[PDB]
Amino acid sequence: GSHSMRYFHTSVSRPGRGEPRFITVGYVDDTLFVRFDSDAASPREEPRAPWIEQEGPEYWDRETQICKAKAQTDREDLRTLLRYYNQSEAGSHTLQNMYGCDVGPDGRLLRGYHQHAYDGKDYIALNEDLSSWTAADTAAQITQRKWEAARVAEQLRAYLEGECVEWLRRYLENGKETLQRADPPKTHVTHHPISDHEATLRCWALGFYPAEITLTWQRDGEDQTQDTELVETRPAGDRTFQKWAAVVVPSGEEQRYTCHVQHEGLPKPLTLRWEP
């Protein structure tokens, strides 16, 4: 199948309450596999999936060093960004970074990413070319100039096309029991009277992995997008995800409504109706 490896990082300043807290997590697809928190008693990169546990002490030491160094660079960056934006030392600010790689079946890079946000807003992003940058504003252009001078894009390209994809390939093999298993959704329709005149039909998808899914309602074969309440896909806590879609159905219309489900674990899309 196609797969991704992504690392997420957040630093949040807390002036007068010590130094910014740094949290980073790594995922393969929708599976968390490593975490680091500078507020832990003994900050270290820690395993969160069984298939990464086999990595030896050299891996954990190296990864922990990288994380600790990123926490420090982020703290310097948060000080720099106060300058760039002419901000006071008094407020809490946020610095985010996501990077990683997407691959297809053969493991070659399909797309790489390396991007940053400040105070919840895009700041600077490596373009798909892995050679040029998109800066959001004149502050980020100052970073762009520095990163062009230092040939940072070239460094990222080398990692994203090389090591990123090679780690992902290793992890997919070591984690082949889980990372290479799709769990299809368990689906059903429920009916919830609202008044004499109408009732909700709710189409459920439970127990699925990965998170990507499409769930829609039609009436007489017409998509009901504007009239559908579609909740965000949500974690169950057992690796799997859940989602539902609901429509308000006038009395007697129930058999005109069909729920449609698409997921990688389903060889064909499903159609379901309320079964009284």
Binding site: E63, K70, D77, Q155, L156
Partner: peptide, 9 residues
């Protein structure tokens, strides 16, 4: 495995 270089903004 992570990207290892420290890059300042």
């Amino acid at each position: 495995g992570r990207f290892a270089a420290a890059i300042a903004k």
